[PDB]
């Protein structure tokens, strides 16, 4: 359209992409965080690794990317690349193979009130420990520890959307069956550093079809 | 338009006429930048004895002093610390030399912390495939001395110092491996006399 072109031209004229999006400074951003599982690829009992396909829904507010719908042709939604906007560094702590950065080539979604919604997909190699003291009539518990990497509890505050993990679009495996997948929030303090860091822990309680 | 304190301060610090990330913060000629580093281990995920490759995720905490990144705190509404991406400021290129891959490149480019007096601190996360020799005379009742060797490929001792902060690596966040047992983690600062 013609009105979306002018709004996109106005929207990114002078936008620093490494300043954090708050009107005040002591105010922390609040990032709603939810994860969805597409399929469980494999869990190697020998190498003690776990390969999953995850979609990382991240929702936060942004005081600078809000506009008036009544002056831009009634447009309310925009798609911008993830290379232009600010975006948080959600990095899983217990990784075992490869780099930690999630791939940024997918596009975001701008509501007129500033709600940025970004859904990157990723292969993740968790490093959970597994006990084979019963075999093959065993239950196994593997955790994934999502959390921000550089920002404090006073600058990024994570909030879960749901109380569990969205298995709504889950491709069935045929070897492992997922019983439940809760999700918890912790505020822990490390011995490197003097400041509090938040994280979100997703457990997975699975059973082998024997 | 309406900007933050951090946007105004970010435009003032990393200014193209005043800051350049390829010249080191030496106030004069032949001044040694004293940096200090301290390794924090997280997990022994695997020790592959046939290919002689151990895998560890470690957290090397390294800090130095950069006199270009100083600001008066009370002028900019009050901001003690400030976080900036790693590619836009100067940093020494400390990597492993005894890694099994050819990846002497730096690890992933998470942003780093700089304080009000210019104390620049950086802790990037890295899994490393270190290469150590396996003493396999006794088996499976064996000790293993496996080493990690950090060194800057670009600069040298005539340009940067490299001070060890604590003698032992900190083991406080350590989750138990269940296959191996660490008994001690001594670190040393090695320099050859008659060889600057």
């Amino acid at each position, epitope marked *: 359209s013609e009105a979306e072109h*002018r*709004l996109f031209e*106005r*929207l990114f*004229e002078d936008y620093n992409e490494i300043i954090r999006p708050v*009107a*005040n400074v002591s*105010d922390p951003v609040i990032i709603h965080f939810e994860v969805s599982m597409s399929q469980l690829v494999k869990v190697d009992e020998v190498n003690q690794i776990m390969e999953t396909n995850l979609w990382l829904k991240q929702i936060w507010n942004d005081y600078k990317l*809000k*506009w*008036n719908p009544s*002056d*831009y042709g009634g447009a309310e939604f925009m798609r911008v690349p993830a290379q232009k906007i600010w975006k948080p560094d959600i990095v899983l702590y217990n990784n075992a193979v490869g780099d930690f950065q999630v791939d940024d080539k997918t596009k975001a979604l701008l509501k*007129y009130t500033g709600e940025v919604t970004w859904i990157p997909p990723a292969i993740f190699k968790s490093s959970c420990k597994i006990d084979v003291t019963y075999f093959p009539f065993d239950y196994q518990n593997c955790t994934m520890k999502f959390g921000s990497w550089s920002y404090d509890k006073a600058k990024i505050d994570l909030v879960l959307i749901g109380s569990s993990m969205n298995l709504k679009d889950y491709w069935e495996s045929g070897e492992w069956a997922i019983i439940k997948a809760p999700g918890y929030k912790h505020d822990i303090k490390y011995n490197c550093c003097e400041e509090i860091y938040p994280d979100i822990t997703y457990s997975l309680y699975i059973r082998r079809l024997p | *338009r*309406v*900007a933050n304190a951090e946007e105004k301060l970010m435009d003032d610090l990393l200014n193209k006429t005043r800051y350049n990330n390829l010249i080191r913060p030496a106030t004069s000629s032949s001044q040694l930048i004293s940096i200090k580093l301290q390794l924090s281990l997280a997990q022994l995920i695997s020790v592959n004895e046939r290919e002689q490759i151990m895998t560890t995720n470690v957290w090397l905490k390294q800090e130095w002093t950069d006199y270009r990144l100083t600001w008066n705190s009370s002028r900019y509404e009050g901001v003690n610390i400030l976080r900036i991406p790693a590619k836009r400021i100067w940093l020494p290129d400390i990597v492993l030399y005894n890694n099994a891959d050819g990846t002497y490149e730096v690890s992933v480019y998470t942003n780093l912390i700089v304080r009000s007096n210019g104390s620049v601190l950086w802790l990037p996360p890295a899994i490393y495939k270190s290469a150590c020799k396996i003493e396999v005379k006794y088996f499976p009742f064996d000790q293993q001395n496996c080493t990690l060797k950090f060194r800057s490929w670009t600069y040298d001792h005539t340009e940067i110092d490299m001070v060890l902060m604590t003698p032992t690596a900190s083991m406080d966040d350590f989750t138990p491996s269940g296959e191996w047992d660490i008994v001690a983690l001594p670190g040393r600062r090695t320099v050859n006399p008659q060889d600057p």
Partner: antibody
Amino acid sequence: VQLQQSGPELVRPGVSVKISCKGSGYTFTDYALYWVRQSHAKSLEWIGVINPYSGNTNYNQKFKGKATMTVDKSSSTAYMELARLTSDDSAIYYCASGYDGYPYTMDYWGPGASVTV
Amino acid sequence: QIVLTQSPAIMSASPGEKVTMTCSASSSMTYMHWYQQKSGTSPKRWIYDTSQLASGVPARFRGSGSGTSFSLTISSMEAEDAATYYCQQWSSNPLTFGGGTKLEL
């Protein structure tokens, strides 16, 4: 959509003054309030911006040590207090509410109070 | 940082005449707004984003410009078009208005 302000006031120089602006006919949050003075020569200047949902203020660098801008979420009313009044401040003061998106304009204007010092 | 200056200060025209007003800047910008104030009453939002029109505005007017020079143009002069026009920019901190152009018959 209406904005309502106070009447004209006669204040001696050296005494602080307070004027008000109360908006009705729309949701008072999610907009933002601009304060604009206008002298007798019809050359009008900008004073400050407040956000009535949080209270974050930005002043003009001419008027940083003078004006103090507050809101009140009970009655949905903003208060502006000027200090150090001199003879060069007898003007017309407007409050103006605009949307806080990329038009960044003054969508609605008040009647205007008259401060004579 | 940016101080606007209008030209001309006082001008006049007959009903049915092309009218051109200019607003100039110290440095470059891209988007600039125009407000209309009549006699006695309050101003109104009149032109935004250098080319667009507000709600209750007849479609005779046209704003155009770029760089450091902008202009408002009236094709058909109206009888009730006697007012004062201000140009203003928000692209540089702080918000500076214009000097004002008084258009009379």
